[PDB]
Amino acid sequence: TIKWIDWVKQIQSIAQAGLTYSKDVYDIERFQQLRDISISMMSHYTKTDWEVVEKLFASETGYQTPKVDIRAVVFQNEKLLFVKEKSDGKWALPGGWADVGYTPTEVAAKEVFEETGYEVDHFKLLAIFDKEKHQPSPSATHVYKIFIGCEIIGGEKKTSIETEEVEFFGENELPNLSIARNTEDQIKEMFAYMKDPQKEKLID
Amino acid sequence: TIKWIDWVKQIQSIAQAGLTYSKDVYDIERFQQLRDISISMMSHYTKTDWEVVEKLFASETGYQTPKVDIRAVVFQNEKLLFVKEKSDGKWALPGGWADVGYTPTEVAAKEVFEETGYEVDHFKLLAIFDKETHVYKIFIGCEIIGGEKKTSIETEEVEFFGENELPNLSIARNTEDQIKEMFAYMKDPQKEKLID
Ligand SMILES: O=C[C@H](O)[C@H](O)[C@H](O)CO
Numbered sequence A: 001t002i003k004w005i006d007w008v009k010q011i012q013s014i015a016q017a018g019l020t021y022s023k024d025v026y027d028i029e030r031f032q033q034l035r036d037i038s039i040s041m042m043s044h045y046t047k048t049d050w051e052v053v054e055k056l057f058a059s060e061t062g063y064q065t066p067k068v069d070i071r072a073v074v075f076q077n078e079k080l081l082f083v084k085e086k087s088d089g090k091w092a093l094p095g096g097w098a099d100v101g102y103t104p105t106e107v108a109a110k111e112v113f114e115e116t117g118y119e120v121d122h123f124k125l126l127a128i129f130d131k132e133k134h135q136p137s138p139s140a141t142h143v144y145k146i147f148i149g150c151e152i153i154g155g156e157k158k159t160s161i162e163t164e165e166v167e168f169f170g171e172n173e174l175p176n177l178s179i180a181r182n183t184e185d186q187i188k189e190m191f192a193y194m195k196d197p198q199k200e201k202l203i204d
Numbered sequence B: 001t002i003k004w005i006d007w008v009k010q011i012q013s014i015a016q017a018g019l020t021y022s023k024d025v026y027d028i029e030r031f032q033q034l035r036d037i038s039i040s041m042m043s044h045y046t047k048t049d050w051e052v053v054e055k056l057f058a059s060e061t062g063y064q065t066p067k068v069d070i071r072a073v074v075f076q077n078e079k080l081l082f083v084k085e086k087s088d089g090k091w092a093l094p095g096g097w098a099d100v101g102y103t104p105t106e107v108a109a110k111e112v113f114e115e116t117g118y119e120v121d122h123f124k125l126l127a128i129f130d131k132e133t134h135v136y137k138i139f140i141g142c143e144i145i146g147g148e149k150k151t152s153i154e155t156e157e158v159e160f161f162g163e164n165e166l167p168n169l170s171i172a173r174n175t176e177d178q179i180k181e182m183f184a185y186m187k188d189p190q191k192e193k194l195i196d
Helices: A003-021 A025-046 A050-057 A104-116 A184-195 B003-021 B025-042 B104-116 B176-187
Strands: A067-073 A079-085 A095-097 A118-130 A143-155 A163-169 B067-076 B079-085 B095-097 B118-129 B135-147 B155-161
Touching: A003 A025, A003 B025, A025 A050, A025 B003, A025 B025, A067 A104, A067 A118, A067 A184, A079 A104, A079 A184, A095 A104, A104 A118, A104 A143, A104 A163, A118 A184, A118 B118, A143 A184, B003 B025, B067 B104, B067 B118, B067 B176, B079 B104, B079 B176, B095 B104, B104 B118, B104 B135, B104 B155, B118 B176, B135 B176
Parallel strands: A067 A143, B067 B135
Antiparallel strands: A067 A095, A079 A163, A118 A143, B067 B079, B067 B095, B079 B155, B118 B135
């Protein structure tokens, strides 16, 4: 019901597109002004520093698309693999932002290895969720979350500075979820796939 | 003070000047998009200020990821919907960059409607390609439920094409192997969905 956030996100996106593709020197200056207005609006109405907002909201290059998050979906004995971050104390599927220069499966494999110690392969395309569709909170950013099924083929469980705990959980014993990293409804869809792996793939 | 009102009027005034003076069709489209949004903003919050959202950037880091391109995969009795591109006069599936504010399926529906005039539904996730600007290319299947064929200033031609009568492909928009894979899915339903 906070309508203004999404208008301002659309204004920045169009200003970014203009700064990328316009060859008209007065129009390029128009798009910069518009981008700078989007930062001023966000800065004021979030009480966030102007230059911090510029970095977080308005420093991308090229046409603006949603950002990509990857979530690795690994089962053992009908229990789903979760990792707990030391700092926030909350639990999620292994994954994170898609690093530029990596394919979606290369991100899944790297994130699982760094967060859990496990080697994985045998990738399956499970789902794409739109983070903003029924999102609890307003978002400055738009995210698509790709869920990739993987098989453990090696390594061994290893914790780290960032990851305090690596554990499997059944559908009826879920730990305290980082809703920012995975929703309860996304976890339910992954247990549905585990029960019926030939089921249609969820795409928002 | 209510600061949003003066900022939106600045946006409106810049967009109006852009609209008047631009000769480039894509700049005119951008300024029209900005005009449209400015109209929508002024028709709400008649008296109220905007809600302050002090936690909006709490867990934001400015992390950049690959860009998303979407291609809509639309079959009509074993022929695939292609579009002749203004930019090169070569052919591609309807699609383009996924826009902020749109789900993957809304993107596929939007691009199909604007490029061809067809309404589509019954979306299926077919594939995500990336042969390593960095781009993840999402292929979404859907079916015509409505509308009718319509050429444009950007889309000179709309044409269905079989696997042995494929036009000159716009290779950046869709590779030969990507098109082949799509025919494979139509012919062998529940073939393993590719993810790079
Ligand atoms: O790529 C898609 C963009 O809409 C066009 O390339 C821009 O309008 C720039 O001309």
